[PDB]
């Protein structure tokens, strides 16, 4: 998770937009960061048609087993890597695929 190139740790929403702005507002450009409003969770910040969108990722526990979800448990992931890898191939609730990592 921390090892992953697309993970930026504790950065703000404005900062994510500045970073995505640096790298040209390319469609499907993305990063994952910690949420400022929800420090227990994460945000997938994604550029689509030159607008940056922010998708909240929250932890939940089912029968003592942690999962992450962007849609109140309709789609569940063991960790951020699984979430990212799924959405590189499947749009799910997103408006586009995760195409390029914001470094």
């Amino acid at each position: 998770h921390r090892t992953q190139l697309w993970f930026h740790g504790r950065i703000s929403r404005e900062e994510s937009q500045r970073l995505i702005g640096q790298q040209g507002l390319v469609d499907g450009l993305f990063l994952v960061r910690e949420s400022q409003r929800n420090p227990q969770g994460f945000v997938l910040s994604l550029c689509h048609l030159q607008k940056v969108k922010h998708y909240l990722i929250l932890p939940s526990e089912e029968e003592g087993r942690l999962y992450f979800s962007m849609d109140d448990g309709q789609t569940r992931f063991t960790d951020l890597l699984q979430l990212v890898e799924f959405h590189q191939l499947n749009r799910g609730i997103l408006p586009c695929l995760l195409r390029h990592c914001c470094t």
Binding site: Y55, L56, M70, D71
Partner: peptide, 10 residues
């Protein structure tokens, strides 16, 4: 589903 985020907007 979350105020202030784009999840399943609108």
């Amino acid at each position: 589903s979350f105020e202030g985020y784009d999840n399943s907007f609108p």
